[PDB]
C-alpha cells in the first residue's frame, strides 16, 4: 500500500515559478515510476511528466522545456519545478505512483495552482 501527499500549490504570477512536491509513504521501496498530471474544470486529466526509479524522465509537449520532474529516493518524493507558469497552466495538478510491478497506481489528493496577475 502506497500513499501520496502533495504540497507546493497556491498562487503565482504569470512568468513566474512553482514547485510541487509529492510525498511518498507506505510500501515505497515497490514504487515503479511517478508521474504528474493536471486537470482544469470541466476537462480530461492532462499528462504532464513521468520519472522512474533510476530517473528516466517523460514529458509531455505542452510543458518541455519548462517543467522538470525529479525524485528523491531518500525522501521518497517526486518534485515539479514549473518554470513560466501561463495562465493555460491553472489547474489541479495531481502526482501518481505506480508500484507492485506497475501493477497498483496511487493519487495524491492534488494541490490547485492558479497563474494570475490579480
Ligand atoms: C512518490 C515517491 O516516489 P519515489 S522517490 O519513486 C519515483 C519513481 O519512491 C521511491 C522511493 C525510494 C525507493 C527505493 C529506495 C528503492 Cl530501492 C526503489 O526501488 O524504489 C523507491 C521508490
Known amino acids: 500500500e502506497v500513499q501520496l501527499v502533495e504540497s507546493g500549490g497556491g498562487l503565482v504570477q504569470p512568468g513566474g515559478s512553482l514547485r510541487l512536491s509529492c510525498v511518498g509513504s507506505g510500501r515505497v521501496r515497490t514504487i515503479n515510476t511517478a508521474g504528474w498530471y493536471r486537470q482544469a474544470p470541466g476537462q480530461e486529466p492532462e499528462f504532464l511528466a513521468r520519472?522512474?526509479?533510476?530517473?528516466?524522465?517523460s514529458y509531455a509537449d505542452s510543458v518541455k522545456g519548462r517543467f522538470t520532474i525529479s525524485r528523491d529516493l531518500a525522501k521518497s518524493t517526486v518534485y515539479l519545478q514549473m518554470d513560466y507558469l501561463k495562465p493555460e497552466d491553472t489547474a489541479v495538478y495531481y502526482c501518481?505512483?505506480?508500484?507492485?510491478?506497475?501493477?497498483?497506481?496511487?493519487w495524491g489528493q492534488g494541490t490547485q495552482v492558479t497563474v494570475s496577475s490579480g
Open positions: 520519472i522512474t526509479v533510476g530517473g528516466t524522465t
Open positions: 501518481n505512483a505506480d508500484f507492485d510491478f506497475g501493477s497498483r497506481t496511487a
